[model samples]
Target chain A: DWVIPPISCPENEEGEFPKNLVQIKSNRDKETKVFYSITGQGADKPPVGVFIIERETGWLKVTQPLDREAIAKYILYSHAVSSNGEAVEDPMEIVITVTDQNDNRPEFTQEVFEGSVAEGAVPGTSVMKVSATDADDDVNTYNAAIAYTIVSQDPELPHKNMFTVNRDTGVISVLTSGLDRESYPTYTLVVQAADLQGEGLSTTAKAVITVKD
Target chain B: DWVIPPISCPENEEGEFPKNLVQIKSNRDKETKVFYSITGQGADKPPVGVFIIERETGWLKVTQPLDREAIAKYILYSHAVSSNGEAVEDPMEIVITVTDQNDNRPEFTQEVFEGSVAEGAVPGTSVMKVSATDADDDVNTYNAAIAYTIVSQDPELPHKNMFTVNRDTGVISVLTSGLDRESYPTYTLVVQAADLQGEGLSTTAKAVITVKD
Candidate 1:
């Protein structure tokens, strides 16, 4: 009644392999010939027959060409016991881990988010900020980047595109308008954020922040 | 300076009249012919021409058959008046009041009214009562006449076809099974009160009342 638990991998990691390496360890007896076979995509398909274990060690280093985006998960196991394909033991549990690279463009959670600005907040008021998460670990955090802006303006409005964003801070502040829900029931802003400032991995999400009368 | 306001009829009386009776009265010199007209239902078509008033007694009675069923609400007007071919010397304020008759039948508010009898309320218990109203004054009161009936029965539903209306009382009570809201959350009833005490007028109205939880 010996069964091993499946292995889980870290969702995102910064940089390249050597840096993104994931290891799968097998737990079988050293006395057994213990033949190894790796068949999944992350593994050398059909089998990485060349590598042999010290039997006692039971360790396998899965190399990459790993693309978390294209192949988010994978499975690996041993097919037989001795050098021969016979005397098969129960199959090992699946090991799935897709090492992520800084590849996916950052995108906001929703196309539009509605928020209300109270009757009064200071002139340099922070109405609300729109944010996004990039699957690429490097770009997911604030350091990589994001920025927002007022996309369309209402002519008879207090803030006619009167808001600005801190490229580094991702904080948006009112530029000119006073909070007035009636004149401006809603503010449709074009929120742009990227892994890099403007040039880095980028994604656009809209934010509709309304002001209350 | 002849700036006269629009002229119309007052409310109709309580008796039955032909198509159009009770005409408007005015004053005129020589052989003045007074014409009658209506605005709402029979606006486009010429009035029944119920009668002609050579002088201004203002009193006119309908000459056509009276069918309360055909007329829900008819707005009559003193559309035109001319003495000696020209317009009358002065237009007068007029209103013809059409009295209501016991013409419509009494219909339940709802095809199915759900009333629950308390778990302890006896068969002859008064769960709830339903009553109807008439649009016409003369017929609107008790005289217009109303009688109810429970068309079906569900022994479980105490207020089923067993209970009867007090022709005068409009109060409905349980007659057979013991009332229980838990056992029967709802009671379906088909109530119908024909005109003149189920005489002939087919007019009816329905309503649905729920028993409180």
Candidate 2:
């Protein structure tokens, strides 16, 4: 008979379980005989034994970790009934959402990348582009959101951060001059494609650029 | 009176000067007092003063260093003359060549590069390609000739040389697998593009790759 706020369960739990997910109680329990039971996908249903409730205590708990990718959300009915098979209270609605933890790390398409640009190329010249994809899903939907960053550059040339990347695009480009194909033929870069924003759940790749004429 | 081998002059000389390029001798010196002179480009001609000759000694010398990109070659005529301007012998042809030195270094388009590939990609899966160019030309045309190589890898992941590059092509590719984006999302590589064969007039570039699903 009451509206319940959605609860969240983190994915890929290691050893923690039998944890209380939520609590459903009736203040009128002292005036009338009342017991609680949940019925849904994971409760007395296909995904049996995952969600359990204490009839006398009204404590709802989970027996196992939930996977967002497999079963993301669940809607169930909570019964507040009398032992006499009479409805002590109209059935209540319960909503549960699986939270996508930073379990998955960002990946690169490959470990090493080779790209080229001409010597004396103006700044902002797109020398090459690299990309990656993520498997993580919703709300903490930010988990798979990737941003590109350049770490270190090799073979410095009286340098001043001569190259740059499009954080949202993963496009490596010229940032400054000194792209002299005659002085430093190639430059090695440490590039990171990070998810969960800046440094969270991130992976890096090798970005090699050839300076040409 | 005779033909001579093409003499070579190196570009960018520091302190070395007045270098004898070649010498011409005449047995006819005993007859009627022979005098010698040279006429042509760089010798009593346009681009004057670069070359000099001894009238009696017939020794040809250079006054300055030569540039292949500027003046690649020179031709001159040596004449054997008497006080009356009489031909002691027929005018002789002389040839000169400018040698290209490894004064220029190989350069990468940029100091940093970004590239990507998927996780578990097969070996030889191309991720990116890098390139470079040089300024030194001809003769040691090999000076600008380039080759690619993998120098190092960072964040080794139970790694076993997981990637490689095509030396002639500069294509970075998957060499083996251990590319678990969940574990190691990105990889950094030190790539080299060398000219004059391996380790010669070469520079390095950053090869960063993103391993994706």
Candidate 3:
């Protein structure tokens, strides 16, 4: 039989030591429940998922893996209890520090796009079209939002600018009347392309403008 | 087809009417899971258990006879859903009343009781015991509580003065010394019985006690 000697505990980080490191009690009725808690490092950083800790031993364990590039880093704490209601001292706490990663690609617009309308378009007539391109693979497809805004308005008639952008197709059109250079000369409009990805998580870029009289 | 007419309701005993007495809204999906709460009673009384009301009915139906002796008098609001969460209200709001019953009995003590002791016993040693009886079939059983009191003290010298009743027993016991009538003398004790059976229902006749010394 192995003989065990009395045990002594070291002082805590605060320099305070528990008078009794462990307490044991016996009654004719044996208690079957046990509870436990843990403290110290839990996780390192954001996008965190895994936690590792030694089983049955009081030694330190990598509570969770660290992940950067997460919108927000969250620290986690774990607690446990037995079937019966009992309070247990927690194990050493785990500290997790997450680090960030550059997984997203910045996007850009396509080079050429076209749109058309009658020579002397009537009011509310359709006109030139525009399109954009995204560098991201999956999410950058049709589902990504495409929006265009008129950057410059020609000072004169027709150029007095009755044109609007097709939020989805990138087509530009006149909202109302007369497009004669003789009547309402040369029109110029500056357009900006932006990824339509709703939450504003998409990248943006701009294009210069031209309109023939 | 029984065509339902425009529904009409009667006023309560207080000469007041409910705002929408005929209105009921039960949206549960099952037949067995329907009930409603009636707020007009003073205490928690239950309605007659005869007809199971349709949870889906806000309409009314007449149920069975009310009996006080059948159950306790208390009010209970119907739970609108089945114990498992199904709703029964089809048409809704049918009201019914159940009454109470009074069928129990008076309490009693056992007819015969025997007690023993050593010959020539000292004070406090029981010699013999007597108990009375009651007739209410209910609460009159031995299960009901009982109490005993000495009606008359025995006569004779030290021996007579020596005997007493074992409070709960109606038993005669020795309280003094001097033996011999030949040592100690014979004695008699009168014992009275009362209702210790809960609710102070009723009591029983007295019992005769005798001690041979």
Candidate 4:
């Protein structure tokens, strides 16, 4: 009996297939010349065609990229059999762990986030929350964590950074003053939510702030 | 002869030892009782004592953490032999790859970064370069990539972010106006260089800006 460990693979959606994960060898290969193969959810059944094993070398490799957000893990059973379909050793349980990556872009809850700020809103005043959901950030890793930032404002009455969003909370707040309901009735801002702490893969959303008296 | 592939392990420096990398097995173990072991660089030669294999299960594990900056690759020989001093399988080449991690902090070239800009400099004026070298950032991975940031600036007479540093390049520039030489004379700034794009491990250096008449 051989104790073969599982494998670790980073999530890849690209067509970078045939990446070898690990090899499975049986001590009974000498006794009966067993050929190695794999079976189970990711190899034979539903959602299959991802993992393939080379019968000659028992090399387990990935044929297609995986989305960890869809499926976090794959369970494959490694089997060894002789040329005449004779069993040699019992199936080896191999767990293929799909590691998370910043592949998915952050999506805002709605296309346009609407909110209102009073005529004389002071600095540090919370305007509204423009939240987003990231498929990768659910894993709680740094590269997947989302950060919100005010990318641009339609009319920079006072300054470019008149309103800034909290990087972690995704809440828009007034950075400086200039919220006038009469003169400047409304303002439009391009809010950005990005993974890898606002420095990696990014997504933009429009925020319409209504200056209310 | 069995051909075992190399190993991949994310660089770990903490005493989190005993991480199982892979397993080795010989088919002739059924014929005679054989124990598994490792030799060569990481096992018995130079920089030994990092890798260990279970004689019974043939599981190869790391006993100590590794620094990819110091040693990137480790070549080891996996051996399988009988209990009574008989060779069962020839030495299988095993390369233990030490993956990069943001373990090392970015260090400034000098304790105090020397950079001077003339007074009354307009916004977007190039000040000087405050460079830093990072051990982990040697690799071009995201977690190891370093970003420069202006941590703090002394004598914020007109604005807080009077000066800013390029997040990618370690260059300081005037973010906005207010480089008046008369009122506020000399300025002290804390420039930070961090790995993980300024979100991971970080180090800071002071930049003293002298006003010119």
Candidate 5:
């Protein structure tokens, strides 16, 4: 008699505001009418307004879309009470697992990045590290797998492929070594980060490398 | 250059005595002969005395056989210091994951379970509930799934299999009717609980049921 059924909610698409999630039932007197309340993550405090429950019918819903990268799971404690504040049954546990959706676009941490290196640096010399993050689940899936690449390079004199970025780790390194500080003191490069292994959604950022003698 | 290699240790058999586990290297100053110290869980304090480290070589060892059921993961902080009492590097974190082993025996919370039922009880009538717990890992594996069964019955007058126990929930119920309180006043039954889907290690307890006229 104390056991309550478990609840599960599906992932909502971005901008899918006010989605109906699940309805929990308390098999009590219809005239007495049990009220429902929830506590823990994704409720009123800490996460603030992710899941809300109606006091009368124990109906639970999400007010806005959820990004798995922000939180992967939520542990909620549900309580059912009577009109005179007497307990009807023991508090039950409700687990909400956020399913993955390819709704979040990868975003660079900063608009512009700057780095410096010696004029005659050898190939494979690490210039800098570029970073980007996606607000999606990355559990052995391609939904949040990020890959980096050199989208474009400015002042392409010797070769357009003067630098290379790591496809997985976002490390930017020198690909060629013929350089003179007086001739080409600076180089501008556009970096792109793509989710789903560089084949899916993508975003772009800029980087500048200064060579010093 | 500061990145340290990960350390791996094998699972220890249950109830085995203390044994050496793994050795950590400082990668600094063979001439300086650095000293080593460690702090955190499984160390010498606060849930203390599971892991010990050599002061000279940074070698770490388990002082006792680890119980995965008791503690699954141990987080430790390692530090290397020069002979001059100066720190050679910042403190680093070492994580020790205890692999599951069928070393723990199922244990009932109470030694004697007491239940009562009215006379002329029908089949499928509720008798009592019994529970036992195993300390091993129970996640997606049968290493800790506990099953209950009636091992034996005392004074087998009416029948031996008069009660049945749930395999998963451990609830005991009357299997057959024809209960006469005047003929049989009480019954004694031996119950068993086993882990690993009831095929692994097991433990036994006693249950007593009284019939009310």
Candidate 6:
């Protein structure tokens, strides 16, 4: 019937695994001698072993480092009870948001991509599209923003750069009009995805292009 | 390279919906006269029309009443841009959680329930397990706690209180063993489920029991 205020617990930077994060407090009679506990995600419940509270004091503590890639936030229910098993106050909600960190590498949905194009295709012809997913924050934040690049290409005979890839959209297109099935029938290129403006964690995959007659 | 802190907005009572929830502020100059905008759930983006922000003061306002049943929380992205079309601050996150309220009525998953019992059955035998769900907070709170009762029974000739339902568990049992297929082959009952300790909103469903020879 009433709204329970949520306790905001600020997150720390990604560091060593199993690091302490914050301490929770509540206003109560010190002489009453109460016990403290928590439920819901990150507690002793389903999502076990992320946070714990001192039974004597209402001090909430985090037991592990956080990864926004895996889980961005946790909703925890906290409560306090007297020694005689009587609730001292209504249970309150705690919002624990795991701040994003550039620790997860981008992963391609497929290890190898295959595409075919005409031998005499236009210069700006689209060869194929590649996509890679990052486990970081799905929000529009920089930690989740990914950029693609064409790292290396085999068969530099048809000019060192025969194909180009969009850094933002990940669409590969023909850069030159020298695609010939007689000289070179196939091309293998490496694609990379990086987060945080191409400075964060990165992953790469291979793409094979066949020039069809 | 850096983690941006999120803005936490406390939820108001259910009655206070369609009202101003919070005012978002960014550290900026009064002379630049920056522009404020927001995206994501409950904003101009996906969950459209639940929240809006004043372009001048960045005052975030809620448009309509909120139901924890429909949506419990929202994640929004806020941004500020200066007069020269330059971003003053990196986009930040806003977490809004809708508190619990006694605004939802309990409802059975099915409209009709069917059960069977032998013609010669002993008292206290469990006939069937009936369940109803509430949309509000399902925790051990009064907002979502539900209680069940057998409000009415057809063919009172057998017994007015021939069946009993547990208030907390919704288990229906035979109160008195007067079940005789030759006389009273079938019975229809009206079951009610109520929230807030059976004092709040309530809903009713039908249960049909057939006696076998």
**Which of the two candidates, 2 or 5, achieves a greater DockQ against the reference?**
5
**Candidate achieving higher DockQ, 1 or 3:** 3
lDDT of 6 by residue, B1-213 (tens): 111222323334345455554456665745587788888978976669888888876767787766666777789888888888988888877777666767778999888999988877799988887789987777736867899999999877477888899999988888996888888888899999999989989999998988887
**What is the C-alpha lDDT profile of model 3 across A1-213, one tens digit per residue?**
111122211111122221112112212112434333343233333333233323222222332222333322334443334446543434322233333222343344454343445546666565766666543333324333545555555554544656777766666777766555455444555566555343333443333233334
Q: Which residue runs does candidate 4 get wrong by more than 4 Å?
A: A1-5, A13-17, A137-140, A158-161, B1-213
What's the TM-score of candidate 4 when only chain A is evaluated? 0.81
Q: lDDT per residue, candidate 5, B1-213, as tens digits?
A: 012123333356544446545455666755577888899978967679788898874657777766665777788988888888888878878878776777788999899999988877788888998889887778846878999999988767588777888989888888887677888878888999999899999999988989887
For model 3, the superposed segments whose C-alpha errors exceed 4 Å read A1-213, B1-108, B112-119, B128-146, B153-162, B166-172, B178-188, B195-213
lDDT of 3 by residue, B1-213 (tens): 111122222112122222222223444423354444443232123443333324344322223333433422333244455556654433223333332122233332554344444445676766766665443222323433445655554555553455566655556666676544544334444455554443343433333333344
Q: For model 4, how does the per-residue alpha-carbon lDDT over B95-208 read when each residue is reduced to its tens digit?
A: 877778777888898877766677767789998888888777455586657789887889877788888888888888888876777888778889888887778888888888
Instruction: Residues B1-213, candidate 2: write the lDDT tens digits.
Output: 011136667787667578665556566776667677889999888899888888876777899988877888899888888777788777777788887877778887878778988986887789998777777783457887778898888877759588888888788889886788888888888888888776687789888888899
Q: What is the interface RMSD of each candidate, in Å?
A: 51.6, 55.2, 35.3, 9.3, 25.5, 14.6
Question: Fraction of native contacts in model 3?
Answer: 0.00
DockQ of 4: 0.05
Give the TM-score ranking, best first: 4, 6, 5, 2, 1, 3
TM-score of chain A of each: 0.51, 0.68, 0.38, 0.81, 0.72, 0.82
Task: Find the 10 residues in a row with the least total lDDT in model 2 chain B.
Answer: B1-10
Which has the greatest lDDT? 4
Give the alpha-carbon lDDT of every model.
0.49, 0.79, 0.41, 0.80, 0.78, 0.76
Against the true two-chain complex, what DockQ does each candidate achieve? 0.00, 0.00, 0.01, 0.05, 0.01, 0.01
Using Cα atoms with residue i matched to residue i, what is each candidate's TM-score against the true structure? 0.31, 0.40, 0.24, 0.50, 0.41, 0.47
**Whole-model lDDT for model 3 versus the true structure?**
0.41
